[PDB]
Amino acid sequence: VDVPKDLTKPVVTISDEPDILYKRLSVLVKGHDKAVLDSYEYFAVLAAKELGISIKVHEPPRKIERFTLLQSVHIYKKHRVQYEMRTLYRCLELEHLTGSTADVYLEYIQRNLPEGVAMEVTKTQLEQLPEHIKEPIW
Amino acid sequence: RKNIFTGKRLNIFDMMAVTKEAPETDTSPSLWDVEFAKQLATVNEQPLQNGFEELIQWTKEGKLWEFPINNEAGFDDDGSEFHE
Amino acid sequence: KFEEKWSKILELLRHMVAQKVKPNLQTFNTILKCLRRFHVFARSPALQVLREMKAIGIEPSLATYHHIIRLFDQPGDPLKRSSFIIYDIMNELMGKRFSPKDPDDDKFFQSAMSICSSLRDLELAYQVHGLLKTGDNWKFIGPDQHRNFYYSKFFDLICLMEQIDVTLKWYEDLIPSAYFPHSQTMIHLLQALDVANRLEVIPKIWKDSKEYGHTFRSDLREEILMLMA
Amino acid sequence: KNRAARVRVSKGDKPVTYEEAHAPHYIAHRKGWLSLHTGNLDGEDHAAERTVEDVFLRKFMWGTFPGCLADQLVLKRRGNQLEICAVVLRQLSPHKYYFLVGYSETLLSYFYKCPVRLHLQTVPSKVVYKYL
Amino acid sequence: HYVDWRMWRDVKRRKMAYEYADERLRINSLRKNTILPKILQDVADEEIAALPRDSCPVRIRNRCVMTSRPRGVKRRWRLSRIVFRHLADHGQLSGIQRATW
Ligand SMILES: [Mg+2]
Ligand SMILES: [Mg+2]
C-alpha cells in the first residue's frame, strides 16, 4: 500500500546537434572465470535485445600465461613450482547504433561489470569527408 | 463555505511588476548567505535509501567514476591542440 | 498585547515599502512564526499574511503552512477552525513537488500528521501521506525524531480507523522498513485485532514485539495476556 | 614434502575452515580467489599496486578488528570501488562494529583515494569444515 | 622504515635518478650523434661524468618491495619468488593458480 504516487523522471534533453553514428561496437571482456563471462554474456545480450540493439557474440581463444619459480628458499634447483594466469574472452559485437544508444548501453553494462572482469570496447564511428577534401584546390 | 485564500489582504505591499530581472551574479558570499544555504541543505538531508542513491551521491561528490568510462576523464593537456 | 505588537510590525512593513525594499519568503515566514504566541488573536491576522504572499507573488513554502498549522492547532476543540484550515491546505498542496526554501520546511509533515490524529480523519492522513510520496517530497519528513513521530501518529490512526486487513498491510510495509514501533503502537495494534475478532495474530505480535525491543515492557505483556485469556 | 599452505594432519582435534583445509593445488579447482581485480589479466596494468593494497588491507583489518575475523577477507574491486567482505564473530557489541565500519571505510577511502565499503557478515562461531 | 639499509639506498638512487633524468637525457643527446663537433661532444662527456654517481639509472636495482631480495624478483608484481608464492599459494593473488598441463 505504501507506494509512491508520482515519480520524478530523469531529464533527458533532445539537443539540436546531430548524433554520432557507430557502425560497430566491439565489446571484448576478459576474465579468469568462464562462468562469470557466461553470466555477463547473458546479461549483456538480454540488455541489448530489450533496447533493440543488434548483437552477435563469439568467444576468442583463451590465453594461458605460464611461468616457473623455484620451490625451495635455498638451492634444490631442479624442484620448481609453476603458476599460470588464464585469460578468457567474450566478444559482444553490436552494430548500427547511435551515439546516444551507445552511451546508455555501455554505461549500463560497464557499471555492472563483475569484479575481476575487464572490458575493451572498440568503437567504429562513421564520418563524412572533410569539406576541404571534397575538391582539389589545384 | 469560504476558502481561506479569499478575504482581506494586508495591502501594505504591492504586486511585484516582475521578479528581479537582472540578478547580482557577482554578489559576494557573506557568512550569513553561505550559512543560510546550509540550512536549506539540511531540510532535505535524509539517509541513503538504497544502493542506487549511494552511487548517485558518490558520483555527485566526484568519488565514483562517471560512466561510460573515459580514460581521459579529468585530463585535458592544457587545452593544447595537435599542431602544438 | 497583540494589538500593540501587530501595530509595530505593520510599521516595519510600511517602512520596508518606503525604502523600496522587497520582502522575501523569510519576511512573511518570520511574521507567522512570531505570531504563534498570540494563538487565537493572531488567527485571522495570520491568514492575512498568507493571502498577501499569494497576491505579491511570493510562493508559500512548506514552512509557511507549518507555521499556520501550528498557530491554528492550539489546545482545544479543533473542529471549529482547524478542520477547514488543513482541508484547504492539502487541496492547495495536492500533487506539488517541493524544493527547500525555508529552514522549517522539514516540519510540515510532522505537524500536518499531528492534526490528522487529533481530528481522527484517516482520509486526510492518506492525503498528507500522499503528498509525502509524490516525487522527492519524502525528503522533507525531518530528522529521526520527526520521522518516528510522523509514523507513530500515522500508523496509530490506521489501526484505529482502518479495516484490519488493510491495517496489517501497513504494518508490514512500515515496520521495520520505515520506522521501529513504540510499545504504545503495538498496544494500539492489539486493540485493533480485538475489535476485528482476529486473535490468531496475537502470537505474531508478541514475536514481532520482541524483535522490536519490547520483550520486557510491562504494559505490553499484560495487554497480550489479558486479551488471550 | 610440500609445506606451502597445508594445514598438516593432527589427532583429529584441530578445526579448520574450508579455505584452510585446501592446499594451493586446489586453488581454481575447489576454492576461489580471495581477491578479484583486473590487474592479473593479460594486457592489464597495475598488478603490483593492487597487490600491495591487498596486503595492507588484510593487515589493517586484522589489527582493526582484533579477534573478530572468522575467515580471510574477500576483496572485490569494481571500477574505482573497493569492497571488503569479512566474516566476523558475534562477540563485540554492535556499537563497536558500527564505529569500526564508519572509521575504517573513511580512513581507507582517504588513504587509497577511492570509495571503500565494508560488508560484515556475523557468525556465532568459526565455521568448521573438518577436524584434522 | 624500509626493509633494510640496502632498500633505503635504492630508494635514494631512484629519487636522485628521477631528479636528474631530464638533465642527463639532454646531455646524452649531445653525445649520441655524429652531427655536433667533437670539441662540443668532449665537453658533454665531462659534464655527464661529473653528475652524481647515484643519478645513473644503471645503479637502480629491482628489489623485492616487501623483503628487499635483490634477485628472484618478478617484475610484474615487484615481489621475490618466495613472497609471491606465499600470497599465490593462499589464493590472495587474483587469477593466479598452480599450472598443470
Ligand atoms: Mg617435490
Ligand atoms: Mg642491474
Short mmCIF file of C-alpha atoms in Angstrom, two decimals, chain B residues 54 58 63-65, chain D residues 79-81 115 117:
data_model
loop_
_atom_site.label_atom_id
_atom_site.label_comp_id
_atom_site.label_asym_id
_atom_site.label_seq_id
_atom_site.Cartn_x
_atom_site.Cartn_y
_atom_site.Cartn_z
CA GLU B 54 24.77 5.81 -2.69
CA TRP B 58 29.35 9.33 -4.83
CA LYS B 63 34.25 9.85 -5.63
CA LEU B 64 32.76 7.43 -8.18
CA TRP B 65 33.88 7.20 -11.79
CA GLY D 79 35.70 0.41 -11.31
CA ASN D 80 37.17 2.63 -8.61
CA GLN D 81 35.03 1.00 -5.91
CA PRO D 115 35.22 4.88 -2.29
CA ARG D 117 32.79 -0.06 1.57
#
